[PDB]
Amino acid sequence: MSVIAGVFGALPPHRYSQSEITDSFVEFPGLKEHEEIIRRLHAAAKVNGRHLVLPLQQYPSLTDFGDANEIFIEKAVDLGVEALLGALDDANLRPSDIDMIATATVTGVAVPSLDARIAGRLGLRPDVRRMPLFGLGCVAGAAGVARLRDYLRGAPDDVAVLVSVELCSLTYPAVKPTVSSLVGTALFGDGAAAVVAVGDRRAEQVRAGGPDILDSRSSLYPDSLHIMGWDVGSHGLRLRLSPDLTNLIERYLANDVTTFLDAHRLTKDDIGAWVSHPGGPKVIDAVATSLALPPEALELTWRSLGEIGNLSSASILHILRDTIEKRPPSGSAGLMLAMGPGFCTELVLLRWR
Amino acid sequence: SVIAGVFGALPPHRYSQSEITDSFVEFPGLKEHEEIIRRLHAAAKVNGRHLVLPLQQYPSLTDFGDANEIFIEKAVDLGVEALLGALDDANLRPSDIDMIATATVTGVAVPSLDARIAGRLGLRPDVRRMPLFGLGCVAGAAGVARLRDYLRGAPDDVAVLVSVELCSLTYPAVKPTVSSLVGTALFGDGAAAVVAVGDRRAEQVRAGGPDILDSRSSLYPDSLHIMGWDVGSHGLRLRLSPDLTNLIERYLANDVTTFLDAHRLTKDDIGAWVSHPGGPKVIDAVATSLALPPEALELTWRSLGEIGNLSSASILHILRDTIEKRPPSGSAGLMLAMGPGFCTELVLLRWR
Fold this sequence. Notes:
The structure is a homodimer. Helix content of chain A is 37%, strand content 25%. By secondary structure, the first copy, chain A, is α+β, with helices and mostly antiparallel strands. In chain A, the strands form three sheets. In chain A, strands 5-4-6-7-1-8-13-12-11 form a nine-stranded mixed sheet, with helices on both faces. In chain A, strands 2-3 form a two-stranded antiparallel sheet. In chain A, helix 3 crosses helix 4 and helix 10 packs across helix 11. Chain A folds into two domains: 1-208, Peroxisomal Thiolase, Chain A, domain 1 (3-Layer(aba) Sandwich), CATH 3.40.47; 209-353, Peroxisomal Thiolase, Chain A, domain 1, CATH 3.40.47.10. The longest helix of chain A is centred in the first third of the chain and has 26 residues, at 65-90. At the A-B interface, helix 3, helix 4, strand 5, helix 5 and strand 8 of A face helix 3, helix 4, strand 5, helix 5 and strand 8 of B. Chain B: This is Methyl-branched alkylpyrone synthesis polyketide synthase-like Pks11. Chain B: Keywords: Acyltransferase, Fatty acid metabolism, Lipid metabolism, Transferase. Chain B: Pathway: Lipid metabolism; fatty acid biosynthesis.
């Protein structure tokens, strides 16, 4: 039941327009033959830009999972300590201060994990507690905040941090011109995010500013492991994405947000700030649709989607910051809502103050 | 937070060390390394291991895509088997579970195993998932420590950890090298589960395992190189350092001494040491740096013998071994582990 003190988003210095990404992408070896679907898909995404970790003309030559994953380890680390520092400074705090650190990626594999590495680089205390969260995916933005709270609930003098870093570009080695992967090449970008939360008691001493994390609720939809995730093989991390995903949302997401809110004597009309994860236009439309929501509401999410792409688990944090920035109106409540492999969902109840 | 159930689970197939080595030297290429493998395999002091697959099938397992595929299959079955076993020990149902945490380092699944487990068991659709990868063999002690950390913010809840390690299946990445040959002598397959319950819920449920009083993690400066996965095209390649033992000899005594002094205890107040069996040379270093007579470590020694090093799962087999030995009441106990990081986790237990 504890309170965010800092949010920060980092991203590769190379921003490319979507048309530039496409104009070039179609000219990639073995792709020109699928120009038509590529153009349409990259234009269907409502993504105007994307930071990439490498120069755009280097991906065509990135084809070994072994190479790309070493690039990941080198590259994820540095965006992370950049994102952590940004948040620690937002929170008027220092590395020594951190008692636990959760790490979220689904986009490369690292052992020892990112947190160990980011712990080495920032000089965090040797006895920092490490929670490297893998295989949660796009929902680890909301889920990562949850495990944070769950931790500070029973440790109110404490400082916990969540670093999300997803470098989708580097999964290229396993991208072939089939619909799922191509949907992938239309939406996903590279980015990092960090959140610094603190105890209620600790909150008053370092004057936290973010809202509080009041409650959470996971929701794991059954018989639906296939809806998304990775097929993992010698060629890297192969994006598995199903069309059935929007269907599941519309038929159950209303139910979830109703039971989570009710348990707080609340209706969907009290939440004065939504922070929703942008899986892509049809997903953002389905959720707007299911929850009977006017467009004012998900506006920061479409605008984040247009500006940085889909960043997996880092997006919601980027949007989280976007809305924090726009200071709602003191007392109001808010609702993170993320979804990812499972298939599953995550709602975080938030109060601003 | 207090332990309620511990249970270990094995694949049906067992094979003695000599039976494994005799076949292993056959495998292609491998016959021209027959000396060292025989040397290495004997000095692992491992007498038998449970391989998830039939022995003469590995030589054909050359693809990491195939291996990871089979991993996901055998890994859930085996983890359910474990969770079910610990859940029964506790006399609790899968539907009583509030949090599930998962330790694997040997296969990459997204969605995590814990999701695939949570479905196979019909755990509540709102159960909290905490997949962890890759903590390494530290992950049994470290996971028990996240449990405490969870339940301590929720005293009425039921949390579980399930660790599943299928090391034989990394095999598409082993080559004729000392460090991949080492791991070939050491690591076996298996799984284990721990159910812990929160304070306010412990009486109401008859919680019999040890209370958990605290843990201490210890990340060593500039030490990535010591333990980890070389990830790539052929799968997960073991990378293990000989410098290892000389990190232990260096900083272990200070790790535990520091932990214990926080509780104003001495090493002499611990009677039962719960130790990770990373093979003979590592276990000596541990007996040596903390001066524990051959008595204090005997359950791990035997475990490394019967079962092999099962990565993050062994320490939970030993924690179960020691508990069924059922320690003096109120006496006190120490879990100690080490994985990739390079790091150390210490868990102070109190028997009941």
